Design a protein around this nucleic acid. Structure first.
Length: 440
RNA sequence: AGAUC
C-alpha cells in the first residue's frame, strides 16, 4: 500500500489495487494530500472524463487545478497539483509548449491500452529512470501481469460456460432464469443490440451502454429497475452497478494493422487479462452480499501485441522531445510489445508538425496521421482522401460515400491509406467527410 | 470497440 516514501525522485511504484479496494476514494486522496503538504508539483492522470469527475468528488476541498471541462470548480491559482486525462497529457507533450517539470506523476488505471496512455507511461517511466521524477501507477492489473481473477471485496463464483453471442430461441435457460441483476459485456454495439433485443423479447428490462449512449443511459442504471445491462467495454472503467452477476463474452473489437498496409476493426478478438479483470470486477463488491457470479465464455488473449495501439504509442513517443533529442522508451514491462527499433518513427521538423496537427486538429487516428505526414503531404491538402485504390472506397449504406469537396466537386471517398476507424460508425464517417471536404 | 482537446 501507499507510504510517503514513494514520493521520492527515481521511485516508480505500482500499486496493485484490486477492484473495489478504494483506489479513488481512499488511496488517491491519501497520495494527493501528502503531495500537497510537501508542495510537490504533481499531475494526476485520469483515463477518462467520467473518471476525472469521480476523482473531483473524492478530492473535493483539496486544491487541484482541473485541466478538463469534465470538472468545473473555482481555482485559487496556488494549487500545486494538476489533474488531466491521459490523452490530454500526451497531446500536450507533442505540442511545442511548456509542460511543467512535474516531480510526481500519478496515473490512474495504468493498464489502459489507449495509445496515448501507453505513450504516457513510457514518457513517465523514462523520466523516473532518468531521476527527474517519481511516479505512482495504480491498477488492478499492472502491465506485465496476467491475472484475470484478482482479489475482490466478496468471493466470486467463477464459471466458464458457453456464452451466447447471438440471439437465441433455446439452449441458454440459465441466462433468463436468473432472478437477479446482470451486467453483460459484449464486443460491439451491434452485437449488444442483438442480445438486448433478444432479452427484451423474453420479457427482460434491458439498458444498453456504449460511448455514444453512456451519459444518458448510465444514469438510468442508477434510477430505474433493470434486469440486464448490456454494455461495451466502456464500462470497464468509471462505471459501477448494483448487480450479482456478470456475463462476459471475453471478446472485444480493437484496431489491428493488417500487413503494415491498412487498419481494420476485426472480430472475433479475445479480451486481455486486464480487461477481463475489470469486467469481472463489476461484481463481488459488497462483503454483505456473498454469492456473486462471473460467467465467462472463453480465454484471454495470450498477447495483445497485434493491437495497433502499441505501434501507435511508439509513433507518438518517437515524436515527443525529451532532452538533447533523446527518445523515451515504452514502460519496460510493455516494451517488447513493439519490435520496431527506437526512433523508427521520429519525423523531421516539418513532417512532425503535420503529424501533430493531423491528430490535434484533424482528429485522425495516430497510424493514419503518420502515413499522411510521412508522405510529405501538408495538413490542408486533402487530395489523398480521394485517390486510393478502389478497395479503399468508403461505403455508406452499402453504396460509395460521397463528399462535396473544397473545390465544389462531388467525389467518392477513397483514401490513399485505409483506416477502418474513420468510418466504423456514423459519427466517425461524418467527421471524416468534413475532413475530406476541407472543413477543418 | 475505446479515447482526448
Amino acid at each position: 500500500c501507499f507510504e510517503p516514501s514513494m514520493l521520492k525522485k527515481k521511485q516508480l511504484t505500482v500499486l496493485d489495487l484490486h477492484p473495489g479496494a478504494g483506489k479513488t476514494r481512499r488511496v488517491l486522496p491519501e497520495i494527493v494530500r501528502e503531495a500537497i503538504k510537501t508542495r510537490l508539483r504533481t499531475v494526476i492522470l485520469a483515463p477518462t472524463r467520467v473518471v476525472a469527475a469521480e476523482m473531483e468528488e473524492a478530492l473535493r476541498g483539496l486544491p487541484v487545478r482541473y485541466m478538463t471541462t469534465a470538472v468545473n470548480v473555482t481555482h485559487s491559482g496556488t494549487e500545486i497539483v494538476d489533474l488531466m486525462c491521459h490523452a490530454t497529457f500526451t497531446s500536450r507533450l507533442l505540442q511545442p509548449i511548456r509542460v511543467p517539470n512535474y516531480n510526481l506523476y500519478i496515473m490512474d488505471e495504468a493498464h489502459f491500452t489507449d495509445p496515448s496512455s501507453i505513450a504516457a507511461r513510457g514518457y513517465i517511466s523514462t523520466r523516473v529512470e532518468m531521476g527527474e521524477a517519481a511516479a505512482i501507477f495504480m491498477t488492478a492489473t499492472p502491465p506485465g501481469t496476467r491475472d484475470a481473477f484478482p482479489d475482490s471485496n466478496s468471493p466470486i463464483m467463477d464459471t466458464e460456460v458457453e456464452v451466447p453471442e447471438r440471439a437465441w430461441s433455446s439452449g441458454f435457460d440459465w441466462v433468463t432464469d436468473h432472478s437477479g441483476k446482470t451486467v453483460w459485456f459484449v464486443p460491439s454495439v451491434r452485437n449488444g443490440n442483438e442480445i438486448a433485443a433478444c432479452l427484451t423479447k423474453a420479457g427482460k428490462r434491458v439498458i444498453q451502454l456504449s460511448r455514444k449512449t453512456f451519459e444518458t443511459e448510465f444514469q438510468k442504471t442508477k434510477h430505474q429497475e433493470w434486469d440486464f445491462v448490456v454494455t461495451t467495454d466502456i464500462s470497464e472503467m468509471g462505471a459501477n452497478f448494483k448487480a450479482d452477476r456478470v456475463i462476459d463474452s471475453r471478446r472485444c473489437l480493437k484496431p489491428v494493422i493488417l500487413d503494415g498496409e491498412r487498419v481494420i476493426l476485426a472480430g472475433p478478438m479475445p479480451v486481455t487479462h486486464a480487461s477481463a479483470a475489470q469486467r469481472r470486477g463489476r461484481i463481488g463488491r459488497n462483503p454483505n452480499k456473498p454469492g456473486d457470479e462471473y460467467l465467462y465464455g472463453g480465454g484471454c488473449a495470450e498477447t495483445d501485441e497485434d493491437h495497433a495501439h502499441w505501434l501507435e504509442a511508439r509513433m507518438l513517443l518517437d515524436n515527443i522531445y525529451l532532452q538533447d533529442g533523446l527518445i523515451a522508451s515504452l514502460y519496460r514491462p510493455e516494451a517488447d510489445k513493439v519490435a520496431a527499433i527506437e526512433g523508427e518513427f521520429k519525423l523531421r521538423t516539418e513532417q512532425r508538425k503535420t503529424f501533430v496537427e493531423l491528430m490535434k486538429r484533424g482528429d485522425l487516428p495516430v497510424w493514419l496521421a503518420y502515413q499522411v505526414a510521412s508522405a510529405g503531404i501538408t495538413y490542408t491538402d486533402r487530395r489523398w482522401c480521394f485517390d486510393g485504390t478502389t478497395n479503399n472506397t468508403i461505403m455508406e449504406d452499402s453504396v460509395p460515400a460521397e463528399v462535396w469537396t473544397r473545390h465544389g466537386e462531388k467525389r467518392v471517398l477513397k483514401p490513399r491509406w485505409m483506416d477502418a476507424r474513420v468510418c466504423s460508425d456514423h459519427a466517425a464517417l461524418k467527421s471524416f467527410k468534413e475532413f475530406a471536404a476541407g472543413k477543418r
